[PDB]
């Protein structure tokens, strides 16, 4: 045939879209757990970028084929739908080609494959929910202390881990909001951790309130109130100007001297507005004047000048305070009585080394706290701060999804026998798709086992015996659920080491990646214009 | 067109620059010949399947075949070969020991000269270790033969020679071995290996084995007589066959009748023949060759015993031993030249009748293993076993001091002699402690055989050394890659096998260091 | 296209191996010398290991990394850069354990990670503090730099301005006691004198040009003058020009460019003004007001540099000219001088006071001589910054790595585990360092290393390293050889951490 382009068929074309998506696999398996080896990415100017995250390598990662492609419009599938996940489906994919392309070679049809694939993934989405661990263990349990301990033992802070994680769990949970039909979830803006150098890490307290780094000034005010009143005004009783980009000409210097005397004359009204609301933890963004300061001694007020909008920002979530940018209403000048005022309990501003830190008790809805990471040097410090950081959200994802399950392929070994199992029961040229779909879930444990430095082939073979066994008999003599742990090379029940994973993760996985499969392996031609 | 070859003067011989590293490369030599042997060190050891020069097919672990199978033409090899073929002498194990410990002592040195240290400083230092480890190695005598002579004593050490040869078998192996070494012991400062033969019979397995006393013979006897005790055995190379006269004897024949006259000269001839046998006082006649219809029944006339060996090498056993000498003519009635015995019977073993020559009158201090299997392979590679394994007990006759084995001695020898090292100044700790990572290779060897990692045996057996734990080897298992006590497992090596292998090892490392250029010649 | 496998990790070795192989040669006093051939057929026989691999082309991304990192040591450090590149090279170059072992990477970074923070402990162990307070010692230290330079004929005239100069900079009151060479020590070069009359100004200098006579020569009070604002017509918020046709729209607006540009000017004048500095430029009508004024026009100031005008004179800065109060007034200051010194004017605003910045006058004979004397302080003023930032020195000569090395080995006997045979590797690695010092002598590098590392086994690891000059033993406290402990551990951490980047490395990959 003449044709204005080019066509290639025959069962070539499977095997060439088969090692396409097994080398874009390649690329991402060895940056497999949190283990993974870093790997570069020379872009076409010749920059350089570093990193082992699987997400961002296939974001980055630019390979002209069409197979491979397909992988990458998957990998923004699985980010926006859960956003995680990405590597193993990309890896489990692969192996199901490579497996399936097996099969056609011994005359077994593409659809008899696809058909097999299909109820390999309901079957293994049944067994999952069959076997998962609703979100519980909160209090009174252990199912996060663990989970914290082994997340943040990498850094230095795991000398004592059990003092730390005592802090997280603690936090995690009274940070806690329903606040839609019984939802609850977790902020991502989380509780502020400051620092200290208070002699030992041992001497870090957790505090159930707010902390903030800035002081009243002057020492004539009080360092302890109990009003519930809390002003938050943005607008700065300083000499207010037009604009940093608009001067004010002014040529007559009679004229210079009153636009002197009386902006020194119209705070007078607008601190006695603000004192007249009767706010006693006031706070200030743009600074505060120094004779508006000398007015809250007598007062007695709690003022504070040049507050971070950041760390101001959450404190107008914690009292509900209405955020004012400017008191004049267009025509004349106001506090906005009963806007801007919180409502709070107690405020005592605490003696903290090099920075007296003030301390805000039991607002209206806060769900926030505040850590002081007292230490010894700002090495331990900045350093605690990340891993604090990093096991925060380890226990945050966990009571965030409403049910989970044991992730180091604990749910890999696991189907590995339930579906080889359920194979024999089918048949109908779908026997040994769904069992080579069994066999191709073993690559994440043998993966993950190899970036863990330990021979995969032994450590593969342990957890499909505690897994086989769970299956034999239901007896307490025989392990179940047990996970793989990456330190120590053996295997591990993750129900007490806390290594767990949300349960749409590995059920989104699963039917990402069969769908991947099957949408290869149904291109058996290639036409090119 | 210059600049041509550098240093090339002498018959055009390959001759390695500077930048070439002429001592590099008789290294890399004697390193080929240890990964063709490290891989069947110890019980897991790898079979080679060997082509002999008779384009026959052999399938055996043994050093000693392969190397002698596999025609080495380097010169350095050679002289490690020559090691081997000297560690077979004052003892009759350890070769691997050579190849696999002088490979590391050369493969080691590499990483010496390509820092800097002179090959002279080098030697110094292994024979300075060499030195030492013989005074470090009485230390770790573990326990000593009670020369009890007692079965359950000698086959007990001598299971750890037995494997390494013949893995599996080596309980029925050291039960045999043990019965043949223990008839001889009594015999106080003779034992030897040639004493012990083996005798190899085509049959079920390695199970229907067994030891008889006198030079066995697996032909069963040709002739009707069950028993004899005939001293004089006339043994003839020349078979029973139409004789030949030496001078022109000329025979011609036209008719048919002239044909059967001559035929029966012939028999009448043989009838005398066999008749001059029991004239010169011997009832008892051997034959290499084929055996004759007419002179079988002559020799059940005169109750003369047949006596049939096709092998060369069965015939010269009994030259050596009674001193019956094979003579060319058929039939010479030579007493002068018979052998003298006490006693000769046929008796059947493992339905099997074999010829035997018992000493009933005299003491009796020779033996032999019958063995049995259903391959010829088989047996030759069980017959090596043998030759390990009845040697080994040849060196306990001398001073009896077993050391541990499983790579036990190599980690504590390697351990007292880095010590030595460390604590020596000078250029000579660099060669020192090298010679302690030579000895690591052979359990590296033992535990790579096996399918594990190499480094996790040397980590646990040095920490289990560090707290004082001597004694301890590599526990041999698939699936379990820790370490074991050799003592109460029962393996244990012998004292000059580890003595005259780390001598010989380091004499043919240093003298391979020693040369440092290859040349040719002509008488 | 790309790499995969095994042959990364020992590609990207031999890359970092061949890039340390360059300048093994070019450590210490007697190092040797370089031939680059420039395509033009031209030579630079330098012996600078920054400018060497600076002018190096390369095609491995890992040699790319090795590269970019000893940059980033410079701008930190101008030492012991090339000490970086050789140990990271030598640290990868031990293959045998990484690939013929088929030993995982993490097995041997956790080694190489935890042999650091052995490395670190065992520096500060040997380290040895220093009285900064005598000016004596720190000429010494110093003196690692000036040596076989041409200075060394006014060594102690490049000590005494880096010293000083550090710790007009260097606010300790602030805890962490931050230093800015780049910026509170702004270095100008001033032609005319000789390497005598080099000094330190206590201001800072400006190299503005006199621009008309009608300004202020010589004043004994200085009053400047600060403000971002430019004294220009006051222009929309966009860029469009002004086009004009109509000649009687030209009065118009040239009556309003007049007026505001006068408005201004009559502000900046009512306090009395010496000078008058500005952030952005100044134009030709602005600048009639100045000279008619009798001030100086100063023009093209950044903000860092005003900023140190202000805590030195007394000014307060302001964003346009019409509100300027009485305070921007430089009372106090020593005296404003414009003088035309060797053909070129320099705004001298010296004063009685350190207002934590300063500026160093290069004077010179010749261009050539003022950049020698330029390059050579720079280092001093550097190693000023290490000593006052951490005042502890280690032996140098080879002995802090030899006696570092010696603790591992003896701390690896208590290592039980495959870890150990790394971790020993990273201490024969260290022992390279005084490898190349006595190659580069001559003398025989077998028999004195082997002697050199017994020494610290018996005698006492602080001392006795090795002399480069001669070749043979020497005590460091006999040798004023010491070096900082910053540039030890930042040298020794990112030789660390640049080997364990290039090992995490298992696939150069392709693609933006």
Known sequence: ?529 | ?523 | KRESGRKVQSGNINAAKTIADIIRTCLGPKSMMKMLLDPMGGIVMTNDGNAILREIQVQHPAAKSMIEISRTQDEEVGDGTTSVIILAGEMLSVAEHFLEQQMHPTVVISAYRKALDDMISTLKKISIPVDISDSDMMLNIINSSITTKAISRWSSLACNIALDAVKMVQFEENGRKEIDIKKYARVEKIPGGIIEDSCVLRGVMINKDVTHPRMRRYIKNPRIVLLDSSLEYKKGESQTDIEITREEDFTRILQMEEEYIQQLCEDIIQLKPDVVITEKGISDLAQHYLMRANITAIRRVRKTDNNRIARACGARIVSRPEELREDDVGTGAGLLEIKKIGDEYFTFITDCKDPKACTILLRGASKEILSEVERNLQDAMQVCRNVLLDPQLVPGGGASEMAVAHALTEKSKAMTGVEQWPYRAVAQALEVIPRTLIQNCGASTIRLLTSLRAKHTQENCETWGVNGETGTLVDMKELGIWEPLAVKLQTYKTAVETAVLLLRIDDIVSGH
């Open chain 2, 1 to 523: 067109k210059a600049p041509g070859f550098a240093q090339m003067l002498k018959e055009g011989a390959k001759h390695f620059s500077g930048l070439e590293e002429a001592v590099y490369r008789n290294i890399q030599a004697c390193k080929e010949l240890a990964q063709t042997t490290r891989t069947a060190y110890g019980p897991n050891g790898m079979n080679k399947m060997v082509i002999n020069h008779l384009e026959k097919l052999f399938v055996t672990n043994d050093a000693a075949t392969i190397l002698r199978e596999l025609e080495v033409q380097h010169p350095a090899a050679k002289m490690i070969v020559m090691a081997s073929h000297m560690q077979e002498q004052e003892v009759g194990d350890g070769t691997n020991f050579v190849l696999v410990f002088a490979g590391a002592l050369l493969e080691l040195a590499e990483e010496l000269l390509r820092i800097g240290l002179s090959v002279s400083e080098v030697i110094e230092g292994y024979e300075i270790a060499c030195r030492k480890a013989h005074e470090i190695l009485p230390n770790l005598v573990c326990c000593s033969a009670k020369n009890l002579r007692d079965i359950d004593e000698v086959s007990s050490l001598l299971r750890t020679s037995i494997m390494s040869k013949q893995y599996g078998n080596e309980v029925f192996l050291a039960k045999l071995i043990a019965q043949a070494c223990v008839s001889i012991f009594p015999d106080s400062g003779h034992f030897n290996v040639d004493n012990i033969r083996v005798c190899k019979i085509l049959g079920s397995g390695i199970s229907s084995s067994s030891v008889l006393h006198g030079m066995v013979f697996k032909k069963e006897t040709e002739g009707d007589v069950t028993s004899v005790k005939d001293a004089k055995i006339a043994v003839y190379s020349c078979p029973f066959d139409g004789m030949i006269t030496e001078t022109k004897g000329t025979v011609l024949i036209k008719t048919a009748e002239e044909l059967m006259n001559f035929s029966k000269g012939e028999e009448n001839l043989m009838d005398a023949q066999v008749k001059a046998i029991a004239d010169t006082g011997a009832n008892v006649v051997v034959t290499g060759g084929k055996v004759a219809d007419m002179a079988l029944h002559y020799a059940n006339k005169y109750n003369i015993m047949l006596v049939r060996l096709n092998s060369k090498w069965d015939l010269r056993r009994l030259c050596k031993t009674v001193g019956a000498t094979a003579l060319p003519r058929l039939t010479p009635p030579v007493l002068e030249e018979m052998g003298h015995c006490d006693s000769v019977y046929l008796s059947e073993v493992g339905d099997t009748q074999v010829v035997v020559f018992k000493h009933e009158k005299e003491d009796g201090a020779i033996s032999t293993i019958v063995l049995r299997g259903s391959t010829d392979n088989l047996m030759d590679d069980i017959e090596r076993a043998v030759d390990d394994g009845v040697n080994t007990f040849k060196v306990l006759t001398r001073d009896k001091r077993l050391v541990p084995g499983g790579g036990a001695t190599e980690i504590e020898l390697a351990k007292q002699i880095t010590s030595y090292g460390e604590t020596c100044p000078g250029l000579e700790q660099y060669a020192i402690k090298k010679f302690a990572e030579a000895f690591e290779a052979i359990p590296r060897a033992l535990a790579e055989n096996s399918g594990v990692k190499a480094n996790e045996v040397i980590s646990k057996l040095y920490a289990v050394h560090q707290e004082g734990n001597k004694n301890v080897g590599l526990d041999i298992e698939a699936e379990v890659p820790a370490v074991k006590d050799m003592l109460e497992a029962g393996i244990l090596d012998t004292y000059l096998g580890k003595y005259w292998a780390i001598k010989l090892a380091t004499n043919a490392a240093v003298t391979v260091l020693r040369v440092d250029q290859i040349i040719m010649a002509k008488p």
């Open chain 1, 1 to 529: 045939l003449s044709v204005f382009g080019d066509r290639s068929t025959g069962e070539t074309i499977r095997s060439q879209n088969v090692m396409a998506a097994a080398s874009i696999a390649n690329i991402v398996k060895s940056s497999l757990g949190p283990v993974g080896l870093d790997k570069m990415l020379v872009d076409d100017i010749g920059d350089v970028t570093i990193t082992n995250d699987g997400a961002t390598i296939l974001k980055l990662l630019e390979v002209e084929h069409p197979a491979a492609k397909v992988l990458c419009e998957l990998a923004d599938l699985q980010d926006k739908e859960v956003g995680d996940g990405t590597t193993s489906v990309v890896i489990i994919a692969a192996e199901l080609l490579k497996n399936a392309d097996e099969l056609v070679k011994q005359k077994i049809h593409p659809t008899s494959v696809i058909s097999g694939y299909r109820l390999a993934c309901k079957e293994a989405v049944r067994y999952i929910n069959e076997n998962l661990i609703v979100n519980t263990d909160e209090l009174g349990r252990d199912c996060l202390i663990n989970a914290a301990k082994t997340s943040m033992s990498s850094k230095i802070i795991g000398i004592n881990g059990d003092f730390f994680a005592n802090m997280v769990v603690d936090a995690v949970l009274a940070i806690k909001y329903t606040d839609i039909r019984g939802q609850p979830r977790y902020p991502v803006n989380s509780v502020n951790i400051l620092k200290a150098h208070g002699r030992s890490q041992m001497e870090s307290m957790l505090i159930s309130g707010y902390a903030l780094n800035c002081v009243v000034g002057s020492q004539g005010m009080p360092k302890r109130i109990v009003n519930a009143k809390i002003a938050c005004l943005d607008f700065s009783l300083q000499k207010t100007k037009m604009k940093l980009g608009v001067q004010v000409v002014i040529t007559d210097p009679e004229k210079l001297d009153q636009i002197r005397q009386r902006e020194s004359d119209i705070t007078k009204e607008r601190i006695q507005k603000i004192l007249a609301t009767g706010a006693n933890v006031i706070l200030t963004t743009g600074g505060i004047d120094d004779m508006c300061l000398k007015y809250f001694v007598e007062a007695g007020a709690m003022a504070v000048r040049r507050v971070l909008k950041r760390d101001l920002k959450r404190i107008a979530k914690a009292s509900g305070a209405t955020i004012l940018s400017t008191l004049a209403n267009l025509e004349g000048e106001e506090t906005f009585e009963a806007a801007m005022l919180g409502q709070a309990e107690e405020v005592v501003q605490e003696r903290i080394c090099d920075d007296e830190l003030i301390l805000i008790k039991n607002t209206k809805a806060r769900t926030s706290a505040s850590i002081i990471l007292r230490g010894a040097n700002d090495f331990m410090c900045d350093e605690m701060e990340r891993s604090l950081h990093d096991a925060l959200c380890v226990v945050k994802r966990v009571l965030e999804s409403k049910s989970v399950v044991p992730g180091g392929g604990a749910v890999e070994a696991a189907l590995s026998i339930y579906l080889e199992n359920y194979a024999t029961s089918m048949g109908s040229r779908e026997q040994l798709a769904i069992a080579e779909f069994a066999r191709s879930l073993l690559v994440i444990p043998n993966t993950l086992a190899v970036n863990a430095a330990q021979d995969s082939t032994d450590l593969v073979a342990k957890l499909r015996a505690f897994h086989n066994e769970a299956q034999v008999n239901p007896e307490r003599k025989n392990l179940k659920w047990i996970g793989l742990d990456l330190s120590n090379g053996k295997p591990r029940d993750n129900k007490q080491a806390g290594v767990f994973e949300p349960t749409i993760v590995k059920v989104k996985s699963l039917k990402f990646a069969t769908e991947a499969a099957i949408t290869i392996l149904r291109i058996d031609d290639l036409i090119k214009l």
